[PDB]
Amino acid sequence: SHSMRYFYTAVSRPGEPRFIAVGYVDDTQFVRFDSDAASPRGEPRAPWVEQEGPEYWDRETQKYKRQAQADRVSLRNLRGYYNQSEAGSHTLQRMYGCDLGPDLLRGYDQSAYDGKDYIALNEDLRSWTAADTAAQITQRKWEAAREAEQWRAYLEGTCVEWLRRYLENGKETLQRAEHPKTHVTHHPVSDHEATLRCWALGFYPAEITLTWQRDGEDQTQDTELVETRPAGDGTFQKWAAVVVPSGEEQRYTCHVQHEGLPEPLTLRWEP
Amino acid sequence: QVTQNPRYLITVTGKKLTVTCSQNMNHEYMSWYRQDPGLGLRQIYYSMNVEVTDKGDVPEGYKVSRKEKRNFPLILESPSPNQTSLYFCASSLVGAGQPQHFGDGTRLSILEDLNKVFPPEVAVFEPSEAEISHTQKATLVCLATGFFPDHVELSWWVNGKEVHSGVCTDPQPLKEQPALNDSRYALSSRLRVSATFWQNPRNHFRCQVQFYGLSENDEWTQDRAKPVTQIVSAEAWGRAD
Amino acid sequence: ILNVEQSPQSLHVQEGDSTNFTCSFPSSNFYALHWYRWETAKSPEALFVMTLNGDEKKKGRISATLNTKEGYSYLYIKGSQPEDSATYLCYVPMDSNYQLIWGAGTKLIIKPDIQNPDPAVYQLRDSKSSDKSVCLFTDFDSQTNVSQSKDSDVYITDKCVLDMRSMDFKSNSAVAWSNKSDFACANAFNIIPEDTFFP
């Protein structure tokens, strides 16, 4: 229901690697770090963290630069695991965070090398799952360093505590719900068919359900759902379209479900 | 485990040095330490990963390398007398979780002139007859004197076997002339046996002093003998009377 | 804050007794704690590696506990034995292992239970190659201290716990020597334990 997540992306450049990190609370970014800046520094991307002060941001910036130096060695170690040359660019990705239950609900720390899964922290926060044998080298290293109890300490404690703090400092924006603004567009496709596109604009959070119905029966197998896109102002957009015959457009209804709606809306093409 | 070499070394000021330590245990972490009286253990350099090197507390004058995980050499480009110390190489399975396994230690002695290196002179002093009458025991005393540097190992050998029971050697040597920065040392040790054991003429007592000095490859321009690594012993036989 | 205190700095306990010493470190900025034992002429040896609060780790007669909330670790030694004489070092990695701080160390010295002491000073027979006469101060109580020498030519070593395993006998000893002609053994260790035998 509420989550905090960090995303690391380290990419080696044979032509120093570039480490890019971002942090999210639910669907709102609040921090960004880029190792290619003049003087790299953790930077705020939401108002409820700009008010934290220099000691907070100096500590964060230190951790980003420490992680970036570490991901550089990891990129060389991974390159050695797979016997890869130093003329090719490779990608190390990491996503971790915590989910708030009613009173931690679930914690996670998963990683990927060159797009495919590599290693992931199991849900009990005491073991790992390795994808290939190379990741088992990584798992044995982290097990020797007792890295599992380090993450359990973070996910069960620090992650939940600061997630609650962020949700309170920015409850005005984070714990609100923007109802989607909705309309239906009609476009002919043939001399016997037309496309009904159901729009949902400027809603927050991003989780939404757009379904088309024919005579009350869900037409989802025939619906084209587009990927939910960011509007750029903190809200999101999405549309769902279905192709209908030219003499049955008034048999199709659109149904939008969102947290910001008191009840799911039912829409219809209004010619 | 951690194979560190050499255990002892004497070099001239400025002659490049490389103290080697290796491990075939797949250990990610390796570090060099040095221990000095009054200062304790101080880290010189450490390596958390292959081709990763970070300075310790006292890295001045030292260089290291981690081209392959097995090896972590300590290089002294131009050694100076202040680097005369006891060095320890250590390794850990990973740089964070596991404990450190230490090597055997390198007692390095950097001198301005090898003319100050002297082998020890060993003498055994047979037990007092008053001690035999009073305590029914007999204490022998072995004296290793006039040696420099402090690279010696004293051991007692009774009837061809090394003995540790009834033995006690001084933990630190004495400077024969304490007002010098190059004074030769003197060491004492004691072997105490029963009066009956000392009174057996078939019992052979020998204290052995292993001197770690120069090598045969070193240059010697002095008229005296080259103070090479050598063993100097003194012996005493049992006395029925 | 990056400081590791080790208390006591030095301590003497009789063989067979039990002892403990403490390691202090800041509660915050903590990552791990190691205990190393460093016997003379040996190398530092790892005893315990503790990373969790309330950790209790036992190895034989040596046990240790870790209190990360108060920043303390206690090392316990039950039934002290002569082998326990060593410098025990406290190693506290800090700042998520980015700071490797060593303690000053607690130097443990095990004293023998010398009952029925027979303090005496003996003169040992000379060797044909030595110009110096050798004196031996032996069989004195464990709480007797051998102060240095007031004569330059006279050399005196410190006490030396000698253990005769087969007879279950231990004896403290100190040796003095000089090449001077006006050097006697009954006038070489000039606080003797009194009732010292002078043959």
């Binding site: 951790k63 990891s74 090398y113 973070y154 | 958390m48 740089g95 | 998520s96």
Partner: peptide, 11 residues
């Protein structure tokens, strides 16, 4: 806040 990186842990 960010998870504290440990000096020496890599992949």
């Amino acid at each position: 806040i960010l998870k504290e990186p440990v000096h020496g842990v890599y992949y």
